[PDB]
Design a protein around this nucleic acid. Sequence first.
DNA 1: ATTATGACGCT
Length: 425
Amino acid sequence: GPHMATGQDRVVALVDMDCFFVQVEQRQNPHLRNKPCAVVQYKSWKGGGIIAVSYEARAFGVTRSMWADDAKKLCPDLLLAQVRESRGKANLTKYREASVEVMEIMSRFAVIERASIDEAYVDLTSAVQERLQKLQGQPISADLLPSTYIEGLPQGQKEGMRKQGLFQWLDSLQIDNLTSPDLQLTVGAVIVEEMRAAIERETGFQCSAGISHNKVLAKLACGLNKPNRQTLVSHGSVPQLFSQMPIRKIRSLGGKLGASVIEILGIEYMGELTQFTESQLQSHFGEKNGSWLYAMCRGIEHDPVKPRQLPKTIGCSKNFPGKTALATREQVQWWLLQLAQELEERLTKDRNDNDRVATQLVVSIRVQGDKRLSSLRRCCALTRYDAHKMSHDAFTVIKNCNTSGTEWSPPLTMLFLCATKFSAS
DNA sequence: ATTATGACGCT
């Protein structure tokens, strides 16, 4: 009772740039804005692969990871912006730079963990205490939360409903108690409205956000009301929200572990998990996963927001699918060179931007017909930011995989170079 | 013939 810690000590947000690549291309090309439009990589095979989709196009069924010619079938007015191609591969530089813009604005407000190019976690705890003392008890006005939904409200015109829910939340709010977690979440949400306002002012990019007490609930919240909205998930709203939440919808339960939770325990929704003891869950899924599940189905998660605004690794990857698979030594070497050349460019930019040098080069390949996405990963030393050296060492490291008697076999379907193990430089 | 990443766990 009085000693069940409820995982309410932190205020955490998850910020997702709505269909980020599409937004970057729509800022750059106004003819695309407020239209069904998607971003593609390549264009020869079935029109190319769609990797990001505006919400107008999503309304037509257009999804990521779908061929452009198919998407056009669903949406004949679909507009398509193409990923830049450099040295024969996709070059994502435009979106890395756009993402750094956004991240740097976010970092003015709180400490941010870059989880991916288009999404960051925010630890708001300090910032909320700062803002709560700045208040000295004044009540929080709805006007401070113009895009915020309160999940589970109203209880008992979509914008009209949002305002009803917000009004119920704010009316029930105890602004005097500077230690109520619901007040802290609310101030976090006010700060997240300011953050998202600043991001849009200063970049033109819109985003959704989730505000709760930990990363998993923040992520889940963020997905509830998109685009261009934010959602506060209170500790108290967890039982109802989880009561019909498919297990697969929680971060990290979307794959094989979530499928085994569903199958072994005979359950469908997150909240069903609360019926099992911690020991039971640990027995089915291991000590770490069991403890994490026991806490997380009660809305409790301790994974911290790591203060890391920069990527930990710099990577260059190309699949060679179907008959494009690499089958000669010359091919493998030329593509290892193209990858090492992009890698060198980005690594030099990184060293100058962020004062660090990588020290380990990871080389990963896939051989044709291998079930695994990585047939082999081998690391070697990364001593100089030199494309020819890196590509030659990558070869040196993989060449024992060729089973011919100048020809390469089984032909390679993937090449991948990753600089890792950064040290301050 | 969903890519190109990127993070993290396990052993």
